[PDB]
Write a protein that binds this ligand. Sequence first.
Ligand SMILES: [Ru+3]
Ligand SMILES: [Ru+3]
Ligand SMILES: [Ru+3]
Ligand SMILES: [Ru+3]
Ligand SMILES: [Ru+3]
Ligand SMILES: [Ru+3]
Ligand SMILES: [Ru+3]
Ligand SMILES: [Ru+3]
Lengths: 173, 173, 173, 173
Amino acid sequence: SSQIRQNYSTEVEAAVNRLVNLYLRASYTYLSLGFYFDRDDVALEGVCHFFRELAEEKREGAERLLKMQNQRGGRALFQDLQKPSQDEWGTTLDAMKAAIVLEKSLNQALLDLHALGSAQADPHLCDFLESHFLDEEVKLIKKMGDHLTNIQRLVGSQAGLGEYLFERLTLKH
Amino acid sequence: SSQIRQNYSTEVEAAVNRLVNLYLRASYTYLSLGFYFDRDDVALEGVCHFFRELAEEKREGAERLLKMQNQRGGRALFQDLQKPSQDEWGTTLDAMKAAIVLEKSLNQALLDLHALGSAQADPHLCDFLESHFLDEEVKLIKKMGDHLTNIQRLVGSQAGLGEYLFERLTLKH
Amino acid sequence: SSQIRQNYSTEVEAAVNRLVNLYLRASYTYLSLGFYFDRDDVALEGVCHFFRELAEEKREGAERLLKMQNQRGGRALFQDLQKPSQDEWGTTLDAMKAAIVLEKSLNQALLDLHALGSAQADPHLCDFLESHFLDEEVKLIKKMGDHLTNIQRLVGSQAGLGEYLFERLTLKH
Amino acid sequence: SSQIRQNYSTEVEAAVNRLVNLYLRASYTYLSLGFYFDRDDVALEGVCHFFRELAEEKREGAERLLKMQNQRGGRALFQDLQKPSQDEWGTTLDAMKAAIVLEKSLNQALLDLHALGSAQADPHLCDFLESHFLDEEVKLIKKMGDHLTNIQRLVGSQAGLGEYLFERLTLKH
Ligand SMILES: [Ru+3]
Ligand SMILES: [Ru+3]
Ligand SMILES: [Ru+3]
Ligand SMILES: [Ru+3]
Ligand SMILES: [Ru+3]
Ligand SMILES: [Ru+3]
Ligand SMILES: [Ru+3]
Ligand SMILES: [Ru+3]
């Protein structure tokens, strides 16, 4: 048992374990999205790389949460990772909408955990979130919003042409 | 009071202060334009950077005018900066039209100040304008004209597609 | 309209727009102060450079606020910038007192916005302020306080001599 | 006789020769000022170097005028250089006042020559003046004005102390 734990409620410990699960699950979802865009009959490499990079970022988020849990003398508990919600992700637009939906749910979970730590007078937790998650998430959501607007602008009359141009001219590949 | 002032009429001094206000006001207008194009629901980074760069150029124009005013033994007097004329700037085309309108008004103010200095036999003023403002403004207006033509060429049938391509392929980002 | 906005109250959005105006207005005030010290009949270059550097810092503060507003899915709204409170700023001492007064008002506005975001459970806002404004402002106010003390120490019997020495030996030029 | 002269009036040619004399005479005056400040019983090296640098600048001004006269197919005619107006130049303040008086007379001569060339429709002359003399002179006069203000600020109660500090802390040496 921990000899270090101090000011670290059971409620926060549990919610941290839940948030780890949410991040690993987001990572899995992004792995599925990335490989869908690598299919021969989809073949949008920039979209593929964007989601693969997100899978790695979400995994790193979970790892940092796990490190913190141990730093505080909490105990990591893992649950099943639920499979992603779809086997096929539709167009780049459907996918980017899905990604924003997912990020908004992770953001609300961060905000909920922050409100918990504030209620429990756990400033270390609040600052950990502030310093490594809250702004990173706002920045990512703004970027997705930006992309979504550009994707939408491009559907207009010839969706295929728009979808190709977005991937070629905005996304990194 | 100044021990240096020589051949520097009260009329030119006042018109210099007015032109400072016009440049600061142009800078403000460009700041608003730039941030409008950074909105998540507009999201045209090259257009954003173009206007932000203009805001900085207009501010530098005002600073040079202020430096000159002091060099001549004139006294800087500042007025309120009126807010920009619009809160939302429409399409890239609407914005570039607005920018050309603004630049033509600044250019006419330079020309009016030049005619004043010529009437007052103030060759230092005339040369200051010639050397740092008149050609810079002609060059900028030609560039905006060029852009406007390309934007217009691209509206044709699918305005969204045109607007994306212009920002991606002409504007710096 | 924004597809990204989350946990971002109308009250904070409006107060952010107000704070942008306050920073731009502080920038303008500093521009006037800087050019007053560049007058031939004032001629204190270190004081000039100190205020000019502040004008740039305040402008950068506003730009960061504007960036954040967009990151959150808020809408930038600009008002008139009121002219600075004085056309002539007196001695270096009068000017530094004026600057501290101005900074204290900006600091109280930051603190008021922080209390709002805390009341609205907006930790991203609170952390943005904490991370880019609150300490920067405390540090600047301490520096102005330090200067003011040294200026005051130097007025004693021969104010002109003191004013020259401060500018030559403390301020950067 | 010249095979190149074109649009170059006898009036401008003569006034150019006069202005050469005025610049050489200013150079001589500055040579006397510089050596006065190198006297063992004056001994203000920064003041000495400031005037010596001005003597060289005024000489270079004359040389450029002479080059131009030949470029235009005019004929250089030299007159006596009148000795400087004083054998002893008083305090740094007296000297800097004298220097500003001299520069204002040279500036008015430039302005008078410019008005002549404008009346004679001689744009090459007007531009030569604009490009190499008018702004250089405005800049120099502003610098002298700045110095004079600082010198004046420092006389106050202990003139010797002020005079030493100005030379040590403003002037280059
Ligand atoms: Ru907190
Ligand atoms: Ru850390
Ligand atoms: Ru002219
Ligand atoms: Ru110049
Ligand atoms: Ru807080
Ligand atoms: Ru940041
Ligand atoms: Ru001319
Ligand atoms: Ru030349």
